[PDB]
């Protein structure tokens, strides 16, 4: 459980406009914004907002257990800071097109050796991994909007004993 006031402050700072400035005829394409189940405002460029909120959560500014969900089909952008939500950690794959590291795990052998040593080179544990943007928690509702790889071997494209991996030929490419 976390207080929702910082979330509202960040949302207002990053261009969200409250309900009294809303007309259904005018904002026929804006995206609604829910915080802990209450409709608090609308936004016209949800993509940059969700990117900013996610980056803030990965940098540790927002509590890592805060759930950030974007429903593109329904034009909604929900945020949860509630208490009692079951989450689990996952690796983060660099999905920025502009980045040279696109489609690769963010965690590298440097992080592994830092973890083994126990300290950084100017205590380094699990929380340091979470706040350094290489691992993040997702709950049962944020999992609806993500594409997960089963193993790091899945991130890149005749024996009778070894098992058979899914072909996954329906998609020309995966992100």
């Amino acid at each position: 459980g976390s207080p929702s006031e910082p979330i509202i402050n960040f949302l207002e700072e990053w261009g969200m406009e409250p309900l009294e400035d809303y007309d259904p005829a005018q904002h026929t394409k804006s995206t609604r914004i829910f915080v802990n189940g209450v409709w608090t405002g609308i936004h016209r460029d949800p993509s940059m907002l969700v990117s900013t909120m996610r980056d803030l959560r990965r940098s540790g500014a927002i509590s890592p257990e805060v759930s950030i969900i974007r429903d593109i089909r329904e034009r909604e952008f929900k945020i949860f800071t509630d208490v009692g939500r079951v989450y689990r950690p996952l690796f983060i794959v660099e999905d920025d097109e502009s980045k040279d590291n696109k489609g690769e795990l963010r965690i590298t052998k440097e992080h592994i050796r830092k973890i083994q040593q126990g300290y950084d080179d100017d205590v380094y544990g699990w929380s340091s991994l979470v706040t350094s943007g290489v691992i993040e928690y997702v709950d049962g509702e944020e999992e609806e909007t993500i594409m997960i790889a089963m193993t790091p071997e899945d991130l890149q494209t005749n024996d009778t004993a070894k098992r058979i991996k899914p072909e996954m030929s329906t998609s020309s490419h995966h992100t």
């Binding site: 394409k29 949800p46 993509s47 593109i72 089909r73 034009r75 999905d95 909007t145 993500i146 594409m147 329906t170 998609s171 020309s172 490419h173 995966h174 992100t175």
Partner: protein, 111 residues
């Protein structure tokens, strides 16, 4: 789409003038009355198709969970496209696919 009174904002109901034999829309809380342009007072569709292709948004290409295909766009002729089945989910819904390009976002089918 139905209209409302321009000074009372209430709903205008259809009415017929006996002496003039004309269709009019008249408010009930006010004397405002406006001439009717179309004779289609009421329409009910037993079998409807709305909600099948209307479920389109401009940023549907930002969803990572959607499959990506290589169908040719009639408008942009791009090599990358995203397809999905009908958003309407009645029990007797067809399974036809709707393909959306990343530039023009035109919805089309392979039929």
């Amino acid at each position: 789409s139905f209209r409302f009174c321009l000074e009372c904002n209430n709903m205008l109901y259809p009415k017929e003038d006996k002496e003039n034999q004309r269709l009019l829309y008249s408010c009930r809380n006010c004397d405002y009355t406006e001439l009717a342009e179309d004779p289609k007072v009421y329409r009910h569709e037993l079998i409807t198709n709305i909600g099948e292709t209307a479920g389109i948004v401009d940023d549907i290409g930002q969803d990572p969970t959607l499959p990506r295909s290589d169908k040719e766009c009639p408008e942009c002729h791009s090599r990358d496209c995203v397809f999905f089945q009908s958003q309407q989910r009645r029990k007797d819904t067809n399974m036809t696919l709707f393909y959306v390009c990343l530039n023009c976002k035109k919805t089309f089918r392979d039929e």
